[PDB]
């Protein structure tokens, strides 16, 4: 929509972006072709590490506003007045598979929300079921390793359907509750647009007087 | 599987909805429990393999969220987005939920390799829209050029700015709720966490006979892909502590 | 198959790999839990960037030996005697999709061989069709960006079937030849064991007298 | 699509094949062309979009490769392996194929971020199995501990070792074939590369009527998924400069 | 300043002495205090700005350490070495000293950028010499190739190996001492840490008149290079709460 | 000069920046003290690698303009009109010693300047003597290794006065020219304000007609 | 001491390590000279970030043994038998200055020991004075920033003698004790050989019965 | 040495000057030589161990440069700045000087580890002030959020923008000078670079008697610090081929 000249990143207009500089049109590529190496270098370093879990996601910008001042239970700005509009960015995700795995797999999904409040960024990072698999964070890597492709051959992608996962489940009964939900139809939702969300943990709301209230976050879809 | 027809379905459906105008909407609700009801339940509030049932504590409608704008660049705004539950604001605070506690450490630590260093916040999609100022300095890809004569505090050369700010009703600094703590230093699971089957059961019991068939199919298809047979039987075995029908239905499909 | 103690990475025996250190069983988690943070830290930095292209691959160790000395056409040691065994590592790959994308997609396949010769490592890095899409390295990033998931929404995974690809093909006739092979049944092979391999480029063989011979590399499956 | 049923199929078959003992086998053969025959063909030898036809220059069987052991750890050995065509040995050498020339720069460069620096050859899977010694030092995650009093050459403090080795029949140092080079510093495609249609034609022409049907379906299916209609036509248009039947068949399927 | 003549003096002296055969020798000695004496002192044991006086708690000779070999490569061995005080072993444990507590976080986290990732223990200088095994995998520059069918625990497929080990007299697992903790969650300095001047004073008071001159000169020389004059006077001011002679002497040399 | 609240990088006002969160004023530090970790984390990761060479430097901003249009010999914008002002950033440096070595050492100096032209960035990277030590870039790593602190003990800092430098010099006579300069008083200049500059290499100037002129770059100090 | 061929890191013997590959001995360098770029690439990535503090160090290998079993007060293996020799590696350092800074500065020194025990690595990381500058870790970055070169111009190297340091001391009396020691002669020691060392913190020894004994670590030089 | 009194002297002086107002000034001057005079000299123009003597080619005053402003933040602006000679603009071009040629590869490579990725141009002090656009995407720490429907070219979906620009008198594209290249692929030093001693002796011969004493002192001080005696003598030996007096003055000081 705005016609600029194609440049190097040092802002040098490029004449020919279809060839390398060589010695004779049939000759060796010259090291001094700094425009080539700049293009390639960049291409060479495009990728960054994907997330350890929830690699696979889709995101969108939006906004939020409360129904009425919740000042009574919490002193949190973004919730203090129905006229305060908070910007938000939201990513939905699967869990096991990588960046280039499939959306339509049997799995928990994530539903994370970044709230750019006026008093700091608030991150609400939840899944689409009301509980999780394990109780202590120390067990995270064991579980995740169990669910994830197996170490010898890297199979399977986006599936809890191999031995380790169930070996872990079969010896860690705490997992059964979420596994239940996983095997339900909540485990293969048909869109993010019709998905539930939970913060799983009991958090605290603290009002202006320092009165603590236990809370648990839900997101319900109005679609 | 729509995993064969369209591996990107959900990604595509969301984007295309926002294009068309039917913005996804969500209602944020809170289950609230007063501090003194902490022990009034069949289970421990801090155990994340347990749900608070809605008929005991109802979900209170609290706000509306609308998603109206697909990002411009997938990588720059999606991929590089950094969400972390320890990112809270005055008015909120944590509890001793042991899953949550550990989470708190990880989402910070994992950015350093994933996003290339401690200045990931300077990336557009992660940058606060409110003012932010401290005495931190440098780090890979620092964009912020600091003019402040001082990189420490307390300092007199800049009249000690920026200054801390005491906790208040609004625009207050952050102060943790002074929860009492009592106990020994121990690596030990709270015994109140040690009941694994009645939540699974309550869930199954509230599924329509055809929803229940689906869960039997889920278990049966997955367990079937398990190569080691004794794993199959130990799961089914566990399933029995949940509900005999379920156990058997599945057992039948796998031959036990 | 050998029975060792579970330790930190510093060799320190772990006693309870099931819980965070906290104050009371219902208490907060202590920063001094060095065992936890080592475990979580390592989990936290498990991932590394995937390849820019051919992220999706499967490999295996093997060996190679020649039929007869080629000493007459090349002074290369690994080809100088039928009794010389050279170890190899081989990786087969797709081109477009990520580490977690599907195997069975329509796409060019990579077929890379690392030869551990006594006189150095020789990497023969080819695809499964005898030619490439483009003529000059300088267009690589353009063609690749075009075939890749599109930049606004990152769709599709492991498919040339979208605009940018055929936009580019359409405007860069050079690509037609390979595109032909891609739309063929070679573009959707049924196993790596039955795949052809080509180094595509013309290389040189150099013998003990300095005589150069042009060469092109082929891998032909005997399965 | 088996992309729905099993997204790991090929990975899985190869592994299980090797487990079982049916070791995939491959024959390496060379197409060989003497120096003076460089310009005796319809097309340019250094054009990586043109194949050397087998009926003109036959593929000579040259050796057997056998894949007989799966790796032990996928990440450690598979993901971390670095292949690069610049990695050749005495007896081999390049040409001016301008697609390869560029490649030569990239496989090295891209290791620096992917494997986290210039010591990637110290990771086991990449490590030569022959001797290697030189005057390079340090870099991230350096494993080799160097005892050499010198980190430069020429040096007299270690009698100049490691020493260079002059080129020879066997065990020689690498020297490049002394190809004559004549021309101006130019960014410009060799006009000999200027013909895009006859190879694509030769290819089609030698496909069985039912292979040809498949190719039509390929183009048809893929083009059908392009949204902008004109792109569709422009492609077919090119298809036309190749063979009329093909162009039409496809065009019919998209309706033009 | 020898900072001019030889900016490497100390580095050189240590190396050359080892070369020569006079290996530096050190005695490791403990100050020991039974748990129940924790509060019998003028000051708080967990305050890292306070020393335990030798005449109250003598330093007990416990072992001898000898440095007898210079490294082979400086970068590989010295520059890459990683020290972290959170690296203790069974029979040692920490205390709530709030400087040491924070320390425990830092020496781990900083390794990830400085040495390139979480496999830094795999570099030779940092590698344990005893066995180490666990279920961690991957991460940048991974050297260890894992053959264990499992990467998790509990696991049945490798019989749950490697197994955890209970605490015991020797060769036991690491258990933390079960210290009682009783307090509210607070960001607050302990009032027992509130006294800043008598340790300084005790220190000064035990210096020979000519050491005492030297301290003055140090303070005088450093404060002399301070630009902002008031900073000069406030320091001298604090000196004043330590000992009047000291404060004055230094005041004299800077003119107040 | 402008009074703001002290915050986390997430813009969250901090109350007490003098303590860690702990269980009781004399108790263990709590892992949930996210303000601490943030602070320490960034502190933990403050450093980046220093330049391989010329690690030691001081720089300043400024500007440049030409005495008259050089349009006759070069089509370079930043030189094409004496009224056009180009911003510059200039970095002076030593060669051997690290970011924290002494300024006042016998050593070549670097004189590098960034010209932010309206037709791209032009970097003119030079030293304070009119020639270098060596002829072919291939030897760089050799010569640098030889002048740098020696590999066994890391000594000395900012000195060419040790065996490996002079070993190299004695077997590489090419160096003798720049060695001479180094041993002169230009090797120990008394300030950057009175230092000459040289681009050392013969470069080209290309005018709008494509006439080429050989050039060498000189900075002369007017103070 | 043992004569090998010069090679690339891929084990390919080098014939000429004195020139790049060019077109004609007076021609431009070809991109295909892979021996060059490997050599330069390695040289180009030689440096890694220095330590945030104690960047300047000197270290040596040694051993340790206890005088008699301490099993009565601790179950720690490396202290359980005078016949058990523990290898060590010990790094002495300054605090403020960088890798290339001087040794002979007025500063605290580090005295860090790595004990390779049969039951794990134990690192005893001390300084040469029995106390530290500050009471809570949360202040570390503030104080360290204070003593470090100042932000604007990066002066001075290896000296507490500037404003920020004494600004910070003057408003944080806690530091006065260690500041005392620094200005003493212990702050300018004459060799590491004659230096004292301190663990500073009170740690715990734990014996076989679970009895805790408070401890403080000392190193005394017998030279 | 002032390396002992003030290690930061130059750094300090330069800053304090600009503070005060005496801006350092510099006159850029070009030595110019018409293409055809390339081989009219005693020596090779492309040999960077040789200076073009002013009395043959005078230095032409061409510009004035003024440093008038210290940076705001040393790290953010000084440490993180990235200078590279390959960074040129239309109107400038390189030559076959084999030192420069290689230089051209390194200043780019090295930024990737030093500044943590290929977006180092996005850091403020390196960011051009003119427009920059291309089809490059992603990379660690990406700041620019691209809105172009196309990340490739040629592309029809954004009318091929950003478009290339043909070379022109002003605002033109960069095209390299079509220097004629003739010769074989070889690793060989041009014989024209093979004379080492006459520029050194031309240098020595033009120093004042007291400047010459200084040079002897430099050489003498340095060589006195070399441990291995034969290195001393070999150097002095090379000094001989330069001028006998120099050689002997120095020899005397070291005893030969
Ligand atoms: C350290 C242990 C750990 C624990 C116990 C949890 N997580 Fe987590 N989570 C991570 C560690 C982690 C992580 C590895 O730190 C990730 C991966 C990449 C990242 O940036 O954060 C992450 C990411 C991540 C994301 C993706 C960010 C996005 O959508 O873009 C979601 C939605 C969740 N998590 C959800 C959860 C939920 C609902 C948990 C409780 C049931 C949970 N995680 C626990
Ligand atoms: C210079 C840009 C460029 C060009 C023109 C080519 N490549 Fe490439 N190739 C790369 C750039 C690259 C890369 C970005 O450098 C990759 C991606 C990740 C990596 O390590 O190397 C790679 C990888 C890569 C792999 C993965 C090897 C593995 O790790 O298993 C294979 C099989 C090929 N390529 C095959 C080819 C063929 C057959 C080409 C044309 C004849 C070709 N590449 C051209
Ligand atoms: C082939 C390698 C190579 C060669 C032949 C040269 N350089 Fe270089 N130079 C580098 C490699 C390098 C480098 C390793 O890339 C540096 C260090 C850090 C950086 O970013 O670039 C650098 C930096 C560097 C700097 C620091 C710029 C600054 O102050 O930020 C200056 C002033 C010079 N060089 C000057 C020269 C001169 C006058 C050379 C001609 C002999 C020369 N270099 C050759």
Q: Tell whether the torsion through CA atoms of H48, H54, H60 and H66 is positive or negative.
A: positive
Our CA angle for A150, A155, A160, nearest 5°, is 75
Residues linked to residue C221 through DSSP beta bridges, in sequence order? D26
- Interchain proximity H91–F61, CB inside 8 Å: no
| Closest ligand by atom to F53 CA | 3
Give the residue, out of D106, D111, D116, with the most ligand 2 atoms within 8 A of its beta carbon, to mutate for a pocket test. Answer: D106
- Selection from H87, H71, H67, H69 nearest residue H125 by Cα: H71
- Interchain proximity F34–B166, CB inside 8 Å: no
Whole-angstrom Cα distance, residue E53 to residue E59? 9
Q: CA B87: distance to chain centroid?
A: 11
Atom of ligand 3 nearest to the CA of H106: 15
Residues linked to residue F58 through DSSP beta bridges, in sequence order? F92
- Selection from G170, G110, G116, G168 nearest residue G144 by Cα: G168
Q: How far is CA D50 from CA D193, F46, F82, in A?
A: 9, 52, 54
Q: Residue D206 contacts by C-beta under 8 Å, 6 or more apart in sequence?
A: none
Q: Are H35 and F213 in contact (CB under 8 A)?
A: yes
Whole-angstrom Cα distance, residue C70 to residue C208? 11
Q: How far is CA B64 from CA A63, B28, F117, in A?
A: 9, 6, 50
Instruction: For residue B31, give both structure tokens.
Output: 């289950």
Whole-angstrom Cα distance, residue H143 to residue H138? 9
Interface test with F, best of H27, H47, H65 (most F CBs within 10 A): H65
Give φ, ψ of D119 to 5 degrees. Answer: -110, 20
In b/e form, how buried is each residue of G130-166, taking b as 16+ CB within 10 angstroms? bbbbbbbbbbbbbbbbbbbbbbbbbbbbbbbbbbbbb
Helix (H, G, I), strand (E, B) or coil at B130: coil
Only one residue has tokens 């009991």, namely: A202
The CA B161 to ligand 1 mean position distance, Å, reads 35
Q: Is D205 exposed, middle or buried (0-12, 13-18, 19+ CB in 10 A)?
A: exposed
Q: How far is CA E86 from CA A201, B113, C33, E50, E95, in A?
A: 30, 22, 9, 21, 11
Alpha helix ranges (H) inside chain G: 34-44, 140-147, 163-170, 176-183
Task: Enumerate residues 119 to 158 of chain A having a beta carbon within 8 A of any beta carbon in chain G.
Answer: none
- Interchain proximity G22–H11, CB inside 8 Å: no
Tell me if A186 CB under 6 Å of ligand 1: no
Cβ of H70 under 8 Å from any chain G Cβ?
yes
Q: What is the DSSP letter of C14?
A: B
Instruction: For residue A174, give both structure tokens.
Output: 């705490």
Instruction: For residue F120, give both structure tokens.
Output: 């791209």
Alpha helix ranges (H) inside chain E: 2-5, 9-20, 98-109, 111-114, 198-204, 209-224, 229-240, 244-254
- Interchain proximity D197–C208, CB inside 8 Å: no
Where are any strands of DSSP class E within G7-139?
A: 22-23, 57-66, 86-93, 110-117, 120-127
Whole-angstrom Cα distance, residue E29 to residue H113? 44
Q: Are E110 and E86 in contact (CB under 8 A)?
A: no
E152 is in an annotated binding site: no
Atom of ligand 1 nearest to the CA of A133: 41
Tell me if A200 CB under 6 Å of ligand 1: yes
Catalytic residues of A: 54, 127
Contacts of A119 in chain F (CB under 8 A): 11-13
- Selection from D227, D249, A122 nearest residue D236 by Cα: D249
Q: Are B222 and A184 in contact (CB under 8 A)?
A: no
Q: Is H124 exposed, middle or buried (0-12, 13-18, 19+ CB in 10 A)?
A: middle
Q: CA C203: distance to chain centroid?
A: 21
> Which residue has the least CA distance to atom 7 on ligand 1?
B103
Long-range CB pairs of A79-83 (<8 Å, 24+ gap) are A79/B62, A79/B63, A79/B91, A80/B170
Whole-angstrom Cα distance, residue E83 to residue G197? 15
Q: Are C88 and C64 in contact (CB under 8 A)?
A: yes
Tally the residues of chain E.
Answer: 256
Whole-angstrom Cα distance, residue A144 to residue C43? 9
Q: Domains, chain C, ranges and CATH?
A: 6-51 (6.10.10.30), 52-131+189-220 (2.40.470.10), 132-188 (1.10.10.1060)
Instruction: For residue G181, give both structure tokens.
Output: 């020691």
Q: Are A95 and A108 in contact (CB under 8 A)?
A: yes
Helices (H) and strands (E) in chain H, counts: 8, 4
Whole-angstrom Cα distance, residue D187 to residue D209? 42
Peptide bond into B154 cis (omega under 30): yes
User: What DSSP letter does each residue of B18-77 carry, written as one string?
Assistant: HHHT---EEEEEEEEEEGGGTT-SSS-TT-TTSPPPTTTS--EEEEEEEEEE--S-IIII
Q: How was this structure determined?
A: X-ray
Cβ of G72 under 8 Å from any chain E Cβ?
no
Q: Are F61 and F89 in contact (CB under 8 A)?
A: yes
The CA A142 to ligand 1 mean position distance, Å, reads 14
Q: Which residue of F has its CA nearest to G57?
A: F154
Q: Are B24 and A221 in contact (CB under 8 A)?
A: yes
Task: Enumerate residues 126 to 165 of chain D having a beta carbon within 8 A of any beta carbon in chain E.
Answer: 137-138, 140-147
Tell me if C186 CB under 6 Å of ligand 2: no
- Interchain proximity E86–C11, CB inside 8 Å: no
Q: Are F35 and F8 in contact (CB under 8 A)?
A: yes
The CA C45 to ligand 1 mean position distance, Å, reads 13
Whole-angstrom Cα distance, residue H64 to residue H86? 23
User: What DSSP letter does each residue of E59-119 carry, written as one string?
Assistant: EEEEEEEEEEE--S-IIIIIIT----TT---BTEE----HHHHHHHHHHHHTHHHHSSSTT
Instruction: For residue E91, give both structure tokens.
Output: 């029979």
Q: What is the number of other CB atoms lying within 10 angstroms of the CB of residue H131?
A: 12
The CA F150 to ligand 3 mean position distance, Å, reads 20
């Amino acid at each position: 929509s705005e016609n600029y000249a194609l440049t190097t990143n040092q802002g040098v207009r490029i004449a020919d972006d279809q060839n390398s500089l060589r010695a004779g049109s049939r000759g060796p590529t010259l090291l001094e072709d700094f425009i080539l190496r700049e293009k390639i270098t960049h291409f060479d370093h495009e990728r960054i590490p994907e997330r350890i879990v929830h690699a696979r996601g889709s995101a969108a910008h939006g906004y939020f506003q409360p129904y009425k001042s919740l000042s009574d239970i919490t002193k949190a700005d973004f919730l203090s007045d129905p006229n305060k509009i908070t910007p938000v960015f939201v990513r939905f995700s699967t869990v096991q598979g990588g960046a280039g795995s499939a959306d339509t797999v049997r799995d928990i999904r994530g539903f994370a929300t970044k709230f750019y409040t006026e008093e700091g960024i608030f991150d609400l990072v939840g899944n689409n079921t009301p509980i999780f698999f394990i109780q202590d964070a120390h067990k995270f890597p064991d579980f995740v390793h169990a669910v994830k492709p197996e170490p010898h051959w890297a199979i399977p992608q986006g599936q809890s359907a191999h031995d380790t996962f169930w070996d872990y489940v079969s010896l860690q009964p705490e997992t059964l509750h979420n596994v239940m939900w996983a095997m339900s139809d909540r485990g293969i939702p048909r869109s993010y647009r019709t998905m539930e969300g939970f913060g799983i943990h009991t958090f605290r709301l603290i009002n202006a007087e320092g009165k603590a209230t236990f809370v648990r976050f839900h997101w319900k879809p109005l679609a | 599987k729509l995993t064969g027809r369209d591996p990107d379905f959900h990604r595509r459906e969301l984007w295309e909805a926002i294009e068309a105008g039917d913005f996804p909407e969500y209602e944020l609700g809170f289950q609230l429990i007063p501090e003194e009801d902490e022990f009034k339940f069949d289970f421990d509030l801090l155990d994340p393999t347990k749900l608070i049932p809605e008929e005991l504590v109802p979900v209170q409608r609290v706000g509306k969220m609308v998603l109206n704008r697909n990002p411009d660049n997938f990588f720059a705004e999606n991929e590089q987005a950094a969400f972390h539950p320890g990112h809270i604001v005055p008015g909120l605070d944590f509890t001793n939920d042991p899953l949550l506690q550990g989470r708190l450490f990880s989402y910070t630590d994992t950015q350093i390799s994933r996003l290339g260093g401690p200045n990931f916040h300077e990336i557009p999609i992660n940058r606060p829209t409110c003012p932010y100022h401290n005495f931190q300095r440098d780090g890979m890809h620092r964009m912020g050029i600091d003019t402040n004569p001082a990189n420490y505090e307390p300092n007199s050369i800049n009249d000690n700015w920026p200054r801390e700010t005491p906790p208040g009703p609004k625009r207050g600094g952050f102060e943790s709720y002074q929860e009492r703590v009592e106990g020994n230093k121990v690596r030990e699971r709270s015994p109140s966490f040690g009941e694994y089957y009645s939540h699974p059961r309550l869930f199954w019991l509230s599924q329509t006979p055809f929803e229940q068939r689906h869960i039997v199919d889920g278990f049966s298809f997955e367990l079937s892909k398990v190569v080691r047979p004794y794993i199959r039987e130990r799961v089914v075995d566990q399933l029995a502590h949940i509900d005999l029908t379920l156990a058997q239905a599945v057992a039948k499909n796998l031959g036990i």
